Write a protein that binds this DNA or RNA. Structure first.
Length: 641
DNA sequence: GCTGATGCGTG
DNA sequence: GTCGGAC
DNA sequence: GTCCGACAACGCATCAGC
């Protein structure tokens, strides 16, 4: 019985401790009870084992339902390159919850804000939907199919059609199913388990309970014959095989069929890196300064590169001539860059048949022959058929080569990948350029190069080793690079007034999760909202922010507080607290009124990546950073005149 | 035909 | 994107 | 360090309401 399913018990038997018969569809309550056991605990090992127990039962009893259960665990709809999106957020969901309970929409919205969780609202509310006959229980594949049905709905009256499907799921929910149906649509499962733990649990499940066995399975626990130490290293090796394959082919529609037909040990023999299938890109860890860089990379030659402020572009050229371009998150952006497709013959040598390039697409002004800010790049359309219609040109800055002429370079050091990149590809100014580099170990040279990058309209420097641990194997370390930005360094900020608070969600439920900040306009003697603040404080600081600021809650805002298009705070705060806030950039804002009219007639100024530093107990709202000072900091930037 | 609200997605 | 928590 | 989920600004695209 799925109501009593406990995948966290000791000595879990994949066949007898499951809550469904062989060949039957996996009930969605089995996935929900698994979610309950996973979110209760905080150790990833315990969460992996709990999920692994569910997956073993799916492997042994209902193999066809392995894919939907995995996607439900990841809260995804399919492969990232397929570009499926629900089209449902908190807006559609709370409306579906309201129509299914007869409550006012504003009441359901207010309760979801107080509890910081929409699933709790969908669970503690009473249904007003009446059915002549009881509905069949939800299944894992059925619930997954309805999710994809929602994502396929487009056109006029499609919103109401989405809500009907959501109402149909709610009317069939049992126990904790409504809570997790709502969380999945809201995109906040609050599990504590994501992609890495799902992969770890998958490899552990197919290793302990091998797929493809005739029922009843003879091998239900392949680790019982091994010592704890032997069991540990074996599962770790098997986990790396799956993780290394998934990083090169993040497509469960491809891995799972191969996994079920040929096992995990033979998986790299079928799923291999190849152009046309996006791969997980290499990421970077922050570094607080140059001294920290020489410590993390001490005793290893490294290179320094400009960190261009654009969008990543993973360019696949296939055997035959087909070109595809993928974002960092494996989204297919080929239709977005017809200008890049036309550029491919100009950048490669005649001996180049196929490749996978790692580049940064940057908005480029061909009149001034200079780099344009990130905001200009985002103004490009999402579908451009004719390249002549393109208004914002882009210049590609290449910095890595992952695949070349039928051969993978994942296991090659950076020094050789960079060697192959610069030998086999041709530069064209303003179109396709190699990233500005510097190979050195001196502190002063790196400091000058960092300052030269900021002057050249870049975020700072990327630091990458050349030979030691310098491969492109994300499964070994996905953040193998270092990023050194100007705003990372101590002493290289604004003092803003807290004018509002926002109820927190998930880990912030029950307290404040965000705050509305404001600068002081000297000319009008008003506080102008500049940005929201939601990170930088510790749990201890935020709990004390919740206790003291609750004493400054107002029914109505002060007449001298201006927020314009900003989100109205759940709790208006009497202006008193002043916080020191750091940001990466100042942007011209479409909503915030801070410093409006001082640099632009219509738009005020906001803060890119704002972060809480410390409380400014010495200053009152009258002494906060002025709006005029905000305008000065904005014009001081490179790309702003 | 226009527009604000909502969703998606990039940093 | 930044950040801190739990491990 | 790793993995995770809190939270930020701001752009295009879609759809309902007008």
């Amino acid at each position: 019985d799925p109501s009593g399913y406990n995948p966290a018990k000791n000595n879990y038997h994949p066949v007898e401790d499951a809550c469904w018969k062989p060949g039957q569809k996996v009930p969605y309550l089995a996935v929900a009870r698994t979610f309950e056991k996973i979110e209760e605990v905080s150790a990833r090992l315990r969460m992996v084992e709990t999920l692994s127990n569910l997956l073993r039962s799916v492997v042994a009893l209902s193999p066809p339902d392995l894919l939907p259960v995995l996607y439900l665990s990841l809260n995804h709809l399919g492969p990232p390159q397929q570009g499926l999106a629900l089209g449902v957020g908190d807006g559609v969901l709370l409306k579906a919850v309201a129509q299914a309970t007869g409550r006012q929409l504003e009441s359901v919205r207010a309760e979801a804000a107080e509890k910081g969780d929409v699933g709790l609202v969908a669970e503690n509310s009473r249904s007003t939907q009446r059915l002549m006959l009881p509905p069949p229980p939800l299944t894992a594949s059925g619930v997954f199919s309805k999710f994809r049905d929602i994502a396929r709905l487009t056109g006029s009256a499609s919103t109401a059609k989405k809500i009907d499907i959501i109402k149909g799921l709610f009317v069939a929910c049992r126990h904790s199913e409504a809570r997790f149906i709502a969380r999945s649509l809201s995109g906040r499962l609050r599990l504590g388990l994501a992609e890495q733990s799902v992969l770890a649990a998958l490899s552990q499940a197919v290793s302990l309970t091998p797929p493809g066995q005739e029922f009843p399975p003879a091998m239900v626990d392949a680790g019982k014959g091994k010592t704890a130490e032997a069991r540990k290293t074996w599962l770790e090796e098997q986990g790396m095989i799956l993780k290394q394959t998934f990083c090169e082919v993040p497509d469960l529609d491809r891995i799972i069929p191969v996994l079920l037909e040929h096992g995990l040990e033979r998986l790299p023999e079928h799923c291999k890196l190849s152009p046309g299938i996006p791969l997980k890109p290499m990421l970077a860890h922050p570094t607080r300064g140059i001294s920290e860089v020489l410590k993390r990379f001490e005793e290893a030659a490294f290179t320094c590169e400009y960190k261009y402020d654009g969008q990543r572009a993973q360019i696949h050229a296939l055997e035959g001539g087909e070109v595809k371009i993928f974002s960092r998150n494996q989204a297919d952006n080929t239709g977005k860059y017809p200008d890049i497709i036309s550029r491919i013959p100009k950048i490669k040598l005649p001996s180049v048949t196929s490749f996978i390039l790692d580049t940064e697409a940057v908005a480029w002004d061909r009149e001034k022959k200079q780099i344009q800010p990130f905001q200009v790049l985002t103004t490009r359309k999402r579908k451009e058929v004719d390249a002549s219609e393109i208004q914002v040109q882009v210049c590609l800055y290449a910095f890595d080569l992952i695949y070349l002429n039928g051969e993978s370079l994942v296991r090659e050091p950076l020094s050789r990948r960079r060697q192959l990149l610069r030998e086999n590809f041709v530069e064209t100014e303003g179109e396709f350029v190699f990233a500005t580099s510097l190979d050195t170990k001196d502190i002063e040279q790196i400091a000058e190069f960092l300052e030269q990058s900021v002057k050249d309209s870049c975020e700072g420097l990327m630091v990458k080793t050349l030979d030691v641990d310098a491969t492109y194997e994300i499964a070994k370390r996905s953040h193998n690079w270092l990023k050194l930005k100007k705003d990372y360094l101590d002493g290289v900020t604004l003092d803003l007034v807290v004018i509002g608070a926002y109820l927190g969600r998930g880990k912030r439920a029950g307290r404040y999760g965000g705050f509305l900040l404001a600068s002081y306009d000297e000319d009008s003697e008003e506080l102008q909202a500049i940005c929201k603040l939601g990170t930088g404080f510790s749990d201890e600081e935020l709990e004390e922010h919740h206790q003291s600021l609750k004493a400054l809650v107002l029914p109505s805002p002060r007449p001298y507080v201006r927020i314009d298009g900003a989100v109205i705070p759940d709790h208006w705060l009497d202006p008193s607290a002043v916080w020191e806030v750091k940001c990466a950039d100042l942007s011209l804002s479409p909503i915030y009124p801070a410093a409006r009219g001082l640099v632009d007639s219509d738009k005020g100024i906001s803060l890119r990546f704002p972060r809480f530093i410390r409380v400014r107990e010495d200053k009152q709202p009258e002494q906060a950073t002025t709006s005029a000072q905000v305008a000065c900091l904005y014009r001081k930037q490179s790309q702003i005149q």
